Amino acid sequence: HHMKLYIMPGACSLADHILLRWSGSSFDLQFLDHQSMKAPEYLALNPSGAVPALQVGDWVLTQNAAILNYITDIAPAERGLSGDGSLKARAEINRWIAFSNSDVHPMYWALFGGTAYLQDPQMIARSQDNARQKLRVLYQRADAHLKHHNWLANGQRSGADAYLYVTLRWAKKVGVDLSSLDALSAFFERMEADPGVQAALQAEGLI
Amino acid sequence: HMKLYIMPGACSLADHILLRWSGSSFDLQFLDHQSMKAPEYLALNPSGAVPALQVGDWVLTQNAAILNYITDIAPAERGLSGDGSLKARAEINRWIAFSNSDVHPMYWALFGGTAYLQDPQMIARSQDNARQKLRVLYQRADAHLKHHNWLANGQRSGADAYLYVTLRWAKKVGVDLSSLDALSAFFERMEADPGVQAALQAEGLI
Ligand SMILES: N[C@@H](CCC(=O)N[C@@H](CS)C(=O)NCC(=O)O)C(=O)O
Ligand SMILES: N[C@@H](CCC(=O)N[C@@H](CS)C(=O)NCC(=O)O)C(=O)O
Ligand SMILES: [Cl-]
Ligand SMILES: [Cl-]
């Protein structure tokens, strides 16, 4: 109740939801729609009208990268979400959060109606194929990294893994080819076997 | 002991500006669209993109990660972490993420990212769309800057360096920044900054 996470089921807010559960923090979910996000109540809270938003008392934090880092910062060290807690450890988490946040996530724009302005069905389809080809390349990079690493950063689970997992769920909704990416596949299954991930998916109605 | 891999005027200029503000000792390593795809740099960064910050044998690559690392190593007296609280770091992070994940990728069609469309009219529509979406994002920044001189905690941070760098691209690609007086004043404050000027000059920019 002191902390409220504004979510849309299956959206990027799911990464923050997963991390909150891994941190062991007490929090309250506030459910939003593509309609309720654009309503004046949430626009007063976040003018951008986009999820996630994390309310800590009267303070409203908005970027996934900022929220994930904030949850990491407040989590007790025993939860192991900051690695050894050094500058290098935080930098490793940050680089992999930025990979999902600024390389992976925006490549999904064409796959979530971002290219509707093209009007031409063939052009819209080409933009989607391009997004899938570029995403395939990015996921091959993540898979190559996961072949020799347990987790993305510092060999320990972090907000970086929660974010990568959420993008993989989108890949599995928009037709991104993840075949022959065995390390990435094992990572996805490890995540889905996790009680914190399962609790989050269930609470959001993705079961 | 630190080496920053740059391309003149690229997103790496934000890290360059912050390194000057931090007072840190650093070397610049200049790259091309060709030298970045060369095997020597691909061994350091397989993504074949700038920035990259080398600290000894360690190579750090994401802009957001580099900006936060520079902030973390800067002496407290430099005032790049605000009051230094979790809320202060979160305010810096939200504004870094705004330029990193909202502004920066909207420039993709404006920098040849929609060439696959082939048809010139469709490529032009993708550029017009990128410009329209960017004016909306810059209106948001302008609305925030109407009541704040700096993006986070009323004190200069890596967030300010990043927003300024994209505003340089806006001017080069035809993004409409008219009637955005607070963002215009921000751009002017930045260009008058000695650390910014020192960075622009070292990069051979104007
Ligand atoms: N850079 C922002 C992006 C925010 C964003 O893309 N939010 C999406 C959720 S994935 C959203 O609200 N989409 C639907 C809408 O705006 O109606 C962040 O990572 O928090
Ligand atoms: N998410 C990455 C994006 C990296 C990136 O976009 N780098 C650009 C510089 S603006 C680049 O190297 N562009 C041209 C190229 O790859 O040839 C970050 O912020 O560091
Ligand atoms: Cl990376
Ligand atoms: Cl923001």
UniProtKB/TrEMBL annotation, chain B:
CDD domains: GST_C_Beta (cd03188), GST_N_Beta (cd03057). It comes from the Bacteria. Coiled coil: none annotated. Residues 2-78 form the GST N-terminal domain. Keywords: Transferase. The keyword Cell membrane does not apply. PROSITE patterns: GST_CTER, GST_NTER. Glutathione binds at C11, H33, V50, N63, N100. InterPro entries: Glutathione-S-Trfase_C-like, Glutathione-S-Trfase_C_sf, Glutathione_S-Trfase, Glutathione_S-Trfase_N, GST_C, Thioredoxin-like_sf. One of its GO terms (molecular function) is transferase activity. Signal peptide: none annotated. Residues 85-206 form the GST C-terminal domain. Belongs to the GST superfamily. This is Glutathione S-transferase. It comes from Xylella fastidiosa (strain 9a5c).
